[PDB]
Ligand binder design. Structure first.
Ligand code: HG
Ligand code: HG
Ligand code: HG
Ligand code: HG
Ligand code: HG
Ligand code: HG
Ligand code: HG
Ligand code: HG
Ligand code: HG
Ligand code: HG
Ligand code: HG
Ligand code: HG
Lengths: 232, 232, 232, 232
């Protein structure tokens, strides 16, 4: 209810998102024989958002994502004045989580952030499945837009109350089940940033893409909902 | 509440269903070592319906499926007058999503819609597990009927409110966990259609099957609920 | 509300349970490279109960399981007069689903119910992991008891309303994640029966075990809840 | 409402947690070809807490974990007077479940608790992925703190009612998806203890770590919530 509480909720939320989703990818996805694969990473990402949106969603709205904050602005749901502090809160929470993750991951012989990719988002030569820039662009635009659309709908005043964290968290699992092979799945500029920093090379070079594409997608989803679906 | 809103909700919903479920199948199911398999595809399909039914379900009823619209007509829940616009809305949303998916998938060297099947529904020689037409027929009839039955029950007036998108989305995950090996799992004529178009050959030839079988199953489920379980 | 509705809900429910859970095991669990494994079977089983308990739970109580009906009798929640019709309804629904499953499965070259086991519950030489009779006995007793305990608690008058189908369905997923290697996981005499019939040999010989053990476990869980946890 | 009921709920809860989560790990995680892997263990752990928190959460608060009881004390949510009986109840429930599990597991030829590890928590040479003590320390501190933070938030008075068992159970699945490779994932001193006893060697030697680290993390999460996020 006071902005210090809200920005703390948002850094904790984005922290948890980065630590849990990227942690699952770095520590467990590829573990020999028993590892969780892409489906387990998708689940982990979506569960970070589900659990935190229930935990701190009644404090801050529970965005944990710059593209979500901006998209909700665009959809007429969030004040332009509050946007920048949220985004900074998210970027900070994210970076702390990646630093801790980097520390933990380093306690294993042979760990190499730069060479492994550190769960970084890339396209072209740095796409996991060798998808071109155009494939990356279209998937991130659609998934960002739909994500915002689901966020708008599930938090609409005519939506039964309480269930939004479930709709929204599971939307993020969905989004990763589809798009990890294309881009390692972003839809979240703060998550891309936290991780790019420690990968240190190409992730930092391509980083601009995973800022503008999700934000543009998020605005589009907000606008479609606001203009086509809301009233009544 | 106005029919333009509703038909837009239904094309967005069916779009999301096609993009997410078939996207997960085309981009991620078979990915080397880390791919999501049939269980991840089943989950993705069911999550498209869960997330969209929460998002736009309070606008359109959230059918996203011709066999569901027709089945709810049969069960006395949906007006015959509204049926055709829903079905067209669903077929259109579906086809746009498949076109986008086709674009994304094409950004990978070696992609071949026709040869891979493009997540198309087939039986006999085009069943994934080599199941005969009779196996295809019985599974789609039962799963379509049960699906409609769950949709009817979970949206019954005596069902606790709010939870239907969860019951219904998870019913679709269930349905795919069972039947992907038989038919690649349809229960949805609009999803079969969107994808058949781009596969281009046998999917278009067998396409008639995945229209009539789900619709017949859906009507049967609506009738059983209406006639045997509703009153009271 | 009228007993014909209730017994129909219970046969449909138990049918769905058998068709979906055993169907997933027979058609999809072992599918080459992409199959769902034991985790996908566990999920499918639990989703049958979740989706049907939401669908028809407000009609019949949504037991779908003889050990649950008897256990709820023992826990003081269900009248002894209604028990036998429920159990028959469940056994009938179950057997129809197994017959349909048998038909579908037969549409694949090389299918052999008897040799594959047809998802039958066995111990000793017919345990999937080679577990002895004593291992089978202890796991089924504990899991049946806990299952009844969760059913009692989640449907207690002080439990927030609406959520029981989620608690109960996910309890069944849990129970299969643990015990498929020991017995192929029963906790449900009607599911064991439907499937034993078509396996035709040893499943029919060991069948007596998967009647008495779950029922005894279910009564124990009902009694613990009734006597130790209920009041207040 | 009476302390005998509450302590019984807590031993049953912790019992179920140990039996189900560690059972899934011992009986099913590594099963040839069809086994559940780390993702299935993570799911099983989280489902024990989800199902029991719905079942007995309205009786005892549904902690099932010493680090949760202590963390809720620290967060101003639970009386210091009730703490010790809860912790004993949890340790007892846990140990009974591990003993039963040990009995079941012994019914398979070649079973070796000591050599397999019996799902025990270890670091360094006894980490599953060869993670050092410092990696173990940082992951358990963060995950324990976040877990307490989610428990605090989801049970806050401004959180929609009913949903906490879902937020909290799925937080535990999350936590295991991340950290099984580092420590076999504890965040729960009673679960570590029950299992260490039967592993018999190094698990007992390292056991002190998985008491103090989770408890410290839990207190930290309680304090952050109490001091930074609660009011309003
Ligand atoms: Hg481009
Ligand atoms: Hg994406
Ligand atoms: Hg993300
Ligand atoms: Hg046929
Ligand atoms: Hg089907
Ligand atoms: Hg579908
Ligand atoms: Hg025995
Ligand atoms: Hg069992
Ligand atoms: Hg069962
Ligand atoms: Hg240390
Ligand atoms: Hg941990
Ligand atoms: Hg645990």
């Amino acid at each position: 209810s006071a902005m210090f509480r809200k920005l703390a909720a948002e850094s904790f939320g984005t922290f948890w998102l980065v630590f849990g989703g990227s942690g699952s990818a770095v520590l467990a996805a590829g573990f020999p024989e028993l590892g969780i694969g892409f489906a387990g990473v998708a689940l982990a990402f979506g569960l970070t958002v589900l659990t935190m949106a229930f935990a701190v969603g009644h404090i801050s709205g529970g965005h944990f994502n710059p593209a979500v904050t901006i998209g909700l602005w665009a959809g007429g749901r969030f004040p332009a004045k509050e946007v920048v502090g949220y985004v900074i809160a998210q970027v900070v929470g994210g970076i702390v989580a990646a630093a801790l993750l980097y520390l933990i991951a380093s306690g294993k012989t042979g760990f190499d952030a730069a060479a492994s990719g550190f769960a970084s988002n890339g396209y072209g030569e740095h796409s996991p499945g060798g998808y071109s820039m155009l494939s990356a662009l279209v998937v991130e635009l659609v998934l960002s837009a739909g994500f915002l659309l689901v966020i708008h709908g599930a938090t609409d005043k005519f939506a039964p109350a309480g269930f939004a964290p479930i709709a929204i968290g599971l939307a993020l699992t969905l989004i990763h089940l589809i798009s990890i092979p294309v881009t390692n799945c972003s839809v979240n500029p703060a998550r891309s940033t936290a991780v790019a920093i420690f990968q240190g090379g190409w992730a930092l070079e391509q980083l601009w893409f995973f800022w503008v594409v999700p934000i543009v997608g998020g605005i589009i989803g907000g606008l479609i909902y606001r203009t086509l679906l809301e009233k009544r």
